[PDB]
């Protein structure tokens, strides 16, 4: 399943500093045109979606979505100990480069292609 | 570090730079204990008279006479 493929992308992409969190930084990275696999999430306003979608198309790179902002929060590694664990939400995110190859990167690029 | 200072000429309009000379206790701290007093500076040691006497026999000094 592609959910684990995103896990395999995001962890390695944030150990080395190559995963960017937050709508504002995603915006400047789309403009600067040095990014891949932008994650949208569900709960955002129609205007805010329209911004990301419009830019992400204009940048001419792969775009994707995930079922909740808490599902993205796990990928971003915002998770923390309750005692058990809880996940802080993240809205939108993307990767700068793949630092080492992984099967999840291939599976995702094939899901795009 | 060799620090630098600006200074103005008599016109108070033209500027020039001068270098601060390294002198006094401030950079000659004991290499064993950071002390500022009683530092032996000879033979490019930089070690205080207290520290010297415990290490002298390891360095290779002896009291012959």
């Amino acid at each position: 399943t592609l959910d684990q493929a995103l896990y395999q992308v995001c962890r390695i992409s944030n150990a080395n500093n190559r995963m960017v969190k937050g709508i504002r930084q995603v915006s400047k990275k789309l403009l600067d045109s040095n990014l891949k696999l932008v994650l949208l999430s569900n709960e955002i306003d129609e205007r805010s979606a329209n911004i990301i979608i419009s830019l992400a198309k204009k940048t001419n790179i792969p775009l994707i979505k995930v079922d909740d902002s808490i599902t993205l929060g796990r990928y971003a590694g915002f998770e923390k100990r309750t005692i058990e664990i809880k996940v802080a939400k993240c809205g939108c995110a993307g990767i700068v480069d793949y630092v080492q190859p992984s099967q999840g990167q291939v599976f995702l690029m094939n899901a795009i292609k | 570090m060799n620090k630098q200072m600006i200074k103005y000429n008599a016109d108070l309009e033209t500027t020039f730079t001068v270098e601060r000379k390294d002198f006094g206790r401030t950079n000659r701290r004991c290499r064993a204990c950071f002390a500022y007093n009683g530092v032996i500076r000879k033979y490019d040691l930089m070690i205080c008279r207290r520290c010297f006497r415990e290490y002298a026999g390891d360095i290779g000094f002896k009291i012959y006479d």
Binding site: - | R31, Y43, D44, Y55, D58, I59
Partner: protein
């Protein structure tokens, strides 16, 4: 008489003795649990030949002797010398009494 050479020679010999004294302190703190007994340290000719005398040897040989690899690295770094130019021999002390 006067020698231009004497000051250099005197400075050079003093500097070697200072490194010995420091490295000895380091190994004593690190290896008092090993019965660290003495050190040899020929700085005057590459390769730097280190002989360390110990009572027990398990913890220096343990896990592919990485403690040796680390001591070599720290001596290399403190002396500002290439790690390739150091040999470390560990010697079990005989006649311990």
């Amino acid at each position: 008489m006067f020698n231009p050479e004497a000051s250099s020679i005197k400075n050079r010999f003093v500097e070697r003795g200072c490194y010995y004294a420091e490295i000895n302190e380091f190994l004593s703190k690190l290896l008092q649990k090993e019965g660290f007994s003495g050190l040899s340290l020929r700085l005057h000719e590459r390769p730097i030949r280190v002989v360390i005398r110990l009572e027990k040897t398990t913890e220096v040989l343990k896990d592919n002797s990485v403690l040796l690899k680390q001591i070599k690295a720290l001596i290399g770094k403190r002396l500002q010398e290439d790690v390739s130019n150091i040999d470390i021999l560990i010697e079990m002390v005989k006649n311990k009494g």
